[PDB]
């Protein structure tokens, strides 16, 4: 009933408190047709990229407040290697193809005990720049491993701090107040989500298809999804219990359609 083993390629993952795969926006998000914006023959899936790529994510202490999120860019994590999420044969194929059109299928493991309380809001959030510092630069692993959980200020609730083109010295620099890549933290449950509660499950299961403004997007620029782990209830436990439960995540690209083969990406 709740023991579901999800074999894919040569990497089968298991979960004995499974709530069920949250297939998003369609019945089967695996089914997808080739891109209509490529006259060349696309590189479809093959048996070394159809597997569960797994990397760690930061721990979840008691000091983490409500709505302190933590964002995983997909496919931004395969390229920067956030959390040790090394793609292997997928990243070595993603760097050599210019356009990439895939749908994801994630699973976040955080095993609490029956004496802990707390709830994460794991949600595949489309089209957000939550991984980018407000000054334009994307975050590096030295920068993620010092804040550990990016707290929900009012700059994220309003979208005041999304990255921008500086107007220059000619225009008077205006008082920025809002930007559409905000987070409304109370409405993240509209996204494809499950709640990683401390009393119903250890792992959540989300399955999202390819979305994007174009029928296929570039490989080195896109952030079409964002695995967002948000703390709705802070972790609390009596002393003696297992402090700082780990959080991992396991990402599987469902049916990718690579296009535009060239040499390895050198910025």
């Amino acid at each position: 009933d709740r023991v579901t083993t999800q074999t894919a390629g040569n990497t089968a993952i298991n979960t004995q408190s499974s709530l069920g795969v949250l297939c998003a926006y369609v019945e089967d998000p695996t089914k997808s047709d080739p891109p209509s914006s490529s006259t060349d023959q696309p590189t479809t899936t093959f048996t070394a990229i159809d597997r569960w790529y797994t990397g760690r994510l930061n721990s979840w202490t008691k000091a983490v407040k409500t709505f302190s999120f933590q964002a995983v860019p997909l496919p931004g994590a395969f390229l920067s290697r956030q959390g040790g999420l090394n793609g292997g044969a997928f990243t070595a194929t993603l760097h050599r193809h210019f356009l990439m059109k895939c749908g994801w299928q994630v699973q976040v493991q955080c095993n609490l005990t029956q004496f802990h309380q707390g709830a994460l809001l794991v949600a595949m959030v489309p089209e957000t720049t939550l991984d980018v510092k407000p000054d334009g630069k994307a975050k590096s692993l030295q920068e993620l491993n010092e804040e550990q959980w990016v707290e929900m200020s009012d700059d994220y609730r309003t979208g005041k701090n999304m990255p921008f083109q500086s107007l220059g010295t000619y225009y008077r620099p205006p008082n920025w107040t809002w930007g559409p890549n905000f987070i409304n933290p109370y409405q993240v449950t509209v996204f494809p989500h499950q709640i990683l509660n401390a009393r119903t499950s250890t792992s959540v299961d989300i399955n999202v298809p390819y979305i994007g403004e174009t029928p296929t997007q570039s490989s080195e620029t896109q952030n079409s999804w964002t695995l967002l782990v948000m703390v709705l209830v802070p972790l609390d436990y009596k002393e003696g219990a297992t402090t700082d439960p780990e959080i991992t995540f396991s990402v599987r690209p469902t049916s990718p359609y690579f296009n535009g083969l060239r040499n390895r990406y050198t910025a």
């Binding site: 023991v3 074999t7 390629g9 040569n10 089968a12």
Partner: protein, 258 residues
């Protein structure tokens, strides 16, 4: 594959059970018990008789017993001592002195693959000489019989009573060998590799099967007792387990880690 090994039964799975794969082909059948034990091996090296010997007296043998040792090969994979069935196998680490060094034997190739308790087979005994140009012979007497130990004066020659009998006295040619196959003669249904019952022949020794043997062979020289030579000549007993059957799986010996 999710299992419970406390149950005691684990279904032996393949690569396809957890992963993507396939079954390998069947290699061969060299693990077949009727095939694997059907090959000869050295059992005991017994000295060749030259006179009408006294069979070894039953244990405990005391001193002053003028008996003849190292002469009879009790045909058995189990540990023997002094041509009689034993429970422990004991070699001599430092054999200096002291009494009579008792001939022990063990089937080294059997117990490394005797992962079972009961074993029944025929026995194919080949008695290879360890002496150049030896003209010998090979006696036998079944599991439960005893050695006929005397002589009869045939024309002023003390011909022993182990030249004749209703049991096979195979005579070897000069420089030849003796090979014959002996049926399962013992009164037990099977030979216990491991036995835990008590034989009540003596003060009851636990773990000692009394009739776990195919009999007992002995090499002699076909001359009367006047023509007794001086140098003691040996012979080597190779046995083969024809038509082997084995029951009740059990343990293999402990390989030490040192």
């Amino acid at each position: 594959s999710t299992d419970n090994a406390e149950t005691g039964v684990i279904e032996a799975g393949n690569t396809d059970t957890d992963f993507s794969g396939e079954l390998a082909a069947p290699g061969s059948n060299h693990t077949n018990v009727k095939f694997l034990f059907d090959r000869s091996r050295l059992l005991n090296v017994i000295k060749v008789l030259e006179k009408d010997a006294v069979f070894p007296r039953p244990f405990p043998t005391q001193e002053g017993a003028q008996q003849d040792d190292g002469y009879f090969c009790l045909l058995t994979p189990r540990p023997t001592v002094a041509s009689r069935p034993a429970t422990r196998f004991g070699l001599y680490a430092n054999p200096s002195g002291s009494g009579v060094l008792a001939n022990t034997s063990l089937d080294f190739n059997f117990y490394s693959l005797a992962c079972f308790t009961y074993f029944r087979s025929d026995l194919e005994v080949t008695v290879v000489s360890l002496e150049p140009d030896l003209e010998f012979a090979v006696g036998w007497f079944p599991s439960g019989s005893e050695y006929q130990a005397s002589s009869f004066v045939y024309d002023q020659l003390h011909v022993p009573f182990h030249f004749t009998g209703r049991t096979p006295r195979a005579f070897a040619s000069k420089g030849g060998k003796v090979s014959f196959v002996l049926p399962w003669n013992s009164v037990s249904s099977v030979l216990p590799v491991r036995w835990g019952g008590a034989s009540k022949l003596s003060s009851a020794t636990r773990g000692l099967p009394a009739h776990a043997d195919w009999g007992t062979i002995y090499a002699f020289v076909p001359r009367p007792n006047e023509k007794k030579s001086t140098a003691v000549k040996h012979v080597a007993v190779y046995i083969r387990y024809k038509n082997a059957r084995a029951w009740c799986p059990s343990m293999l010996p402990f390989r030490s880690y040192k």
